[PDB]
Amino acid sequence: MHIPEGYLSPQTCAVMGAAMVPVLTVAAKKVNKSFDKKDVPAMAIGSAFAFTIMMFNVPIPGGTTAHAIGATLLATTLGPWAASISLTLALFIQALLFGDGGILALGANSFNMAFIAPFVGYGIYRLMLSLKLNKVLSSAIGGYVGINAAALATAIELGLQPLLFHTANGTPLYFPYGLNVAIPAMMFAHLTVAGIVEAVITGLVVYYLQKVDEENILHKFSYRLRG
Ligand code: NI
């Protein structure tokens, strides 16, 4: 869903950066509150994992691109704040080093993929947990909803462009397609294939982490001491 350069007005870009600033500020403090030398490495690995996942994507005509993120997976494993930092970091790398996602677009994509996706996904996850679903199932479900929410947010941001930013001739200055085009394109891509991929990946890794703990008998003694 990464939005490229020139799709959003400088004003839109500015807005999302301003909205995203407090989010990252808070995440940092929360993370800052909870350090061992070691959770920093964790963030990096997650970040590298997400980055790698995102590299597998397809164009959506009338929208941007589609791919999975691993966002809810990160929120559920690291806590959402750390995930948002991890995720923001990956997009920043993509932007500065790969021309993938606009640099001016950093505020928007992070708002979508580093804030909305992991926070929504985490919330649905917690909700499904409260409905007594196992973590695997729950996380796959959270993953689906989180990524579709991010896609929606993207679609609304693109689709609003011709409405808000146009020439005196009615000519779109940036992204040229409306909500009528953008919502269906982005949501159809994300509600069907990509969201399934996200769910399966999130669930797969959780399952895998679940039973790895579930063994090394060592674990059953030391998990009540995790402090
Ligand atoms: Ni993207």
From TrEMBL:
NCBIfam families in the cross-refs: PRK11909.1
GO biological process: transition metal ion transport
Cellular component annotations (GO), alphabetically ordered: plasma membrane
Cellular localization per UniProt: Cell membrane
Coiled-coil spans in chain: none
Major subcellular site: membrane
Bilayer topology annotation: Multi-pass membrane protein
Presence of keyword Transport: yes
Transmembrane residue ranges: 7-28, 40-60, 72-97, 103-125, 137-161, 181-209
Name under which the protein is recorded: Cobalamin biosynthesis protein CbiM
Entry keyword set: Cell membrane, Membrane, Transmembrane, Transmembrane helix, Transport
Gene3D superfamilies reported for this sequence: 1.10.1760.20
